[PDB]
Design a protein around this ligand. Structure first.
Ligand SMILES: NC(=O)c1ccc[n+]([C@@H]2O[C@@H](COP(=O)([O-])OP(=O)(O)OC[C@H]3O[C@@H](n4cnc5c(N)ncnc54)[C@H](O)[C@H]3O)[C@H](O)[C@H]2O)c1
Ligand SMILES: NC(=O)c1ccc[n+]([C@@H]2O[C@@H](COP(=O)([O-])OP(=O)(O)OC[C@H]3O[C@@H](n4cnc5c(N)ncnc54)[C@H](O)[C@H]3O)[C@H](O)[C@H]2O)c1
Ligand SMILES: NC(=O)c1ccc[n+]([C@@H]2O[C@H](COP(=O)([O-])OP(=O)(O)OC[C@@H]3O[C@@H](n4cnc5c(N)ncnc54)[C@H](O)[C@@H]3O)[C@@H](O)[C@@H]2O)c1
Lengths: 383, 393, 388
């Protein structure tokens, strides 16, 4: 079931492995959109099904008139969402430059509707999204426990654990609100929100002689809507519910990148998204140290950029990965018949690297999120 | 040779200021595209206009049926023809999806014609192209002297030199390599030289108790290509002249599809925007180090996205700019006539009391030789080889 | 049949040996075509068999006219060609000096049609030899494992191992391509690779908060060398190679005059022009002259006079080691005791018989193959399983 160079390893020793590794200077975790699922979020499949069910006419027109995809893919549920958005953007630019009014009218709906649905799927609660007592909710036991656990495996003189989320929902300040923790992200002041690099150099300390982590918003923000005038601002999850999200979701007007969000492969057809560059440069600088550690969970395999940086400097004897993939046996079986898509071949390459710096563990029920939470032990004063 | 209000100024002060600024731990130089115009260089605009004039039969379809450009815009040289072809790169897929065969043929014919037109005049080596390191020719001998100025100005225990090239050809790079120094162009290797972002933040030293330089190509490459390797492969020129450049040189009408990686195309494909984004990131954020002096020359500020990026990159408070305008008198006369956006903006910038901006309007003093001479300097090798070789019968 | 002073040793002793030798200041390895038979390639035996029964004129002349060989040796297939190559060089020298004409032509033909076959036995793949991403085949997994193990075992304060190749192909560089490994073999360059004596002290560093390499010392030159009048070796890929300098096999015949640089011949002074070769030997001598340094030999065919003489003179280093994995150990000793022996087999027999415990000869047979050698080297273990 588990193959590591033809040998066998036990999780009992891996417990001590994690416990000792976390004591190393660098500590972090590289998650994805899988975490949102644990809190009740909607996966890509659900969003695609909703879009295809709520707009049958567009699907039929695409199937018949132009045949960008075949009905076989739809029958087998092998439809990708990002490719559709990128195709829509390129066709929209073609229309805008060719001045085809009807194509512009029929394509200024696909983009606007797609982004409206993306935003609607971003929220994890619905009408409760405007309700307060956000920390007090009982569905965030995951984040509430995990933030403290990451910060509470330390003794004075160590670093700040880093949590990686790649979802629109502002779901990380909520557990922080519950526990009073401050997941810093380089912003100061409530009434006004702005970015400053120096703000990243603040850490709590006992004066008469704290628990917090740090934030990398790789997947943009839900309310940093750039007005194309050199501005960035944030509006609380209950205040933006009426100001501009309501206007752009109910006024049925022309759609642009009103609030910056990138769910499609086409990234820099609009070149004013600077969170991309800053966050990715910081991510690149992170692995530049020895005695390094990191973990992965709740993340798929479709990220060209991050998954190039991953193996970029896995040629260090201190950077590691503890990567799980429940659908690894199926991927291997599919590849054995000739090969798969980008994801299958990428995971095969990741698993087949001849190093011991990496290891893969599976088994199905044994690799659940609750199991990942339970693996972390309680710190011991006298080991 | 800087004028401000009609009073003469000495070049010694500017030379001393430049020398003082060059001592910073973060310094670099840039070479303009027009500097090579005097050494047989060519611009894509000239070939584009020559081809469009020679074949006006297709012109009607290019604008009326596609509207990527307007006749006024095409004639005014206010277009990004590279972006025109890049947009054709997706028009091809649009037609294929729509089964628009006639437009597909039109796009393919124009792409191949423009490719061959640009290629045939860019060989500059005849049938001996595949010979490696053909920079030994005396045509660029003078340029070598310039490089000699970058060796005696580097003191021990100082930041290593940085090299930035603007052209997309290796004519200057072949010479630079022939001088006998190790330069990295973002890749490492001999047979299959690939892209690796780690090398952007790594240096070299001696493990036991030293000089490294970085070559930054600002126009991609004529060598960078993609043989379905899912990566970027770079090699020497010979196998390039045998693999895919041959047909681009010889075949009149021959294209295959979205396989190669140049010259800033296929961005919508995931496989080519990644490296370009990495290079843009490093270019824009390399000035993040303290004690940095940056010089930008030859940029028209005519691109919306690049203009916005430059405006946002004002974070560095130690930026200096020098602008050479060979037609300053013409701009002044035009302003005197109540006419002329770019000309008015540059005139307004030149007509303000800001000492950190340098303007040169000598006209005939802006030549390449004058610029080389302005740089500071300290203050028959092969002749006998031919005789010795000839003596031995 | 295992005998070491009438006693035996357990696996723990060998494991401690491997751990200590790897953890010493320096590590050693030497690679030859010995066990390169199980990868689907070809051996020189088939090449010689084809050569004898495909060129009747020269074989008949040698048997009858030249008398430079013996029929019995050819029948037994135990003859050597390297001595014949040296004899060809000497014959060409004398014939050129004396101003003979026909013999000049015949010996030029012999030399060129022998160089052709010398280069012809370094493909192992066929037509697909000319492509990129060459490190994507089943024949390099063991090479990848060995290189990763040899490059990983250098904790802080420990340098990269030195590797010796002694064949024609570049399988190891091709295993290097696939893992971001650049096995610095004495040449660093893209357009022109020139020998810089100071290139041995260059490596990557984590300047602002990949350190993999070795020293693949080449003492046979390289198949990928083409010698120009400029006294420099610009270097090419496998496909560029197949294109521009080894297409003479089919189109043309016997027009090769000192382009690529590889010599099976025993003599090292007919090819005296090179002086960097003495620098390679000097690097070997620097290797021999340090304590806690070990050399491992797998693939050496007992065919040197300079390097092996340095081995004898250097084995007197209190820590230099010399070990060979050669299954035919009992047979050679028995044959020597029976009055046989080869040109150099007596030398290895003596080195086994040398009274130095610094050198120990260990066999086993099936466990002494290149696969076992690759599997032997373990990875560094800092965080993983420990003791106490
Ligand atoms: N604005 C910015 O600052 C910025 C910068 C860079 C990137 N981004 C965005 O960041 C990237 C975030 O990644 P993403 O949104 O494209 O997708 P993703 O990688 O976050 O998720 C892909 C999906 O795979 C699913 N999945 C999990 N396990 C799976 C399995 N075993 N098999 C199959 N599927 C599985 C998950 O439900 C889901 O994560 C976006 O690509 C990109 O738009 C934004
Ligand atoms: N790493 C790299 O290889 C790299 C780096 C930077 C740019 N590029 C190139 O840039 C990317 C896109 O091209 P681009 O639009 O940024 O550059 P560009 O030079 O093609 O366009 C810049 C703008 O300047 C305007 N302009 C005004 N006056 C001009 C003049 N006298 N001469 C030239 N232009 C004048 C043009 O209208 C417009 O092209 C492509 O990848 C590639 O073509 C590549
Ligand atoms: N003149 C020069 O400048 C120059 C250049 C390179 C090497 N050299 C040197 O040249 C000498 C020969 O080169 P090498 O050491 O690389 O050769 P090598 O390492 O390739 O020798 C191994 C080969 O396998 C053996 N072999 C193959 N088939 C056999 C068979 N059927 N039966 C028995 N034995 C068989 C042969 O002994 C042959 O030597 C070396 O001492 C040394 O490398 C000199």
């Amino acid at each position: 079931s588990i193959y590591q160079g033809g040998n066998k390893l036990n999780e009992d020793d891996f417990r001590s492995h994690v416990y000792s590794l976390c004591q190393l200077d660098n500590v972090g975790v590289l998650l994805g959109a899988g975490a949102s699922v644990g809190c009740g979020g909607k996966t890509m499949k659900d969003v695609w099904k909703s879009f295809k069910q709520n707009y049958p006419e567009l699907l039929g027109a695409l199937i018949d008139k132009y045949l960008l995809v075949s009905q076989i893919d739809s029958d087998n549920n092998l439809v990708n969402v990002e490719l559709l958005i990128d195709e829509a953007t390129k066709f929209l630019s073609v229309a805008k430059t060719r001045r085809c009014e009807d194509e512009e009218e029929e394509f200024r709906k696909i983009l606007s509707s797609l982004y409206k649905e993306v935003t609607k799927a971003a929220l994890l609660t619905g009408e409760q999204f405007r309700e307060k007592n956000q920390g007090k909710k009982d569905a965030f036991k995951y984040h509430k426990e995990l933030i403290s656990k990451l910060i509470s495996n330390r003794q004075p003189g160590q670093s700040a654990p880093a949590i990686f989320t790649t979802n629109y929902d502002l779901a990380l300040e909520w557990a922080a609100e519950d526990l009073g923790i401050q997941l810093f992200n380089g912003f100061s002041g409530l009434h006004t929100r702005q970015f400053y690099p120096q703000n990243f150099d603040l850490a709590f300390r006992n004066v008469n002689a704290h628990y917090h982590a740090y934030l990398y918003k790789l997947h943009g923000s839900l309310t940093w809507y750039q007005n194309d005038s050199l501005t960035v601002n944030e509006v609380s999850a209950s205040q933006a519910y009426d100001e501009y999200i309501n206007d752009i979701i109910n006024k049925d007007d022309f759609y642009r990148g009103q609030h910056l969000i990138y769910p499609g492969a086409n990234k820099y057809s609009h070149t004013i998204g600077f969170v991309y560059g800053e966050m990715f440069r910081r991510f690149g600088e992170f692995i530049s140290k020895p005695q390094t550690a990191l973990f992965i969970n709740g993340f798929g395999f479709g990220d060209y950029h991050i998954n190039r940086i991953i193996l970029g400097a896995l040629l260090n004897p201190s950077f590691h990965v503890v990567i799980y993939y429940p659908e690894l046996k199926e991927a291997i079986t599919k590849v054995s018949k000739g090969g798969g898509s980008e994801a299958e071949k990428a995971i095969v390459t990741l698993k087949n690297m001849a190093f011991n710096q990496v290891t893969v563990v599976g088994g199905g029920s044994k690799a659940y999120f609750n199991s990942f939470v339970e693996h972390l032990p309680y710190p011991v004063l006298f080991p």
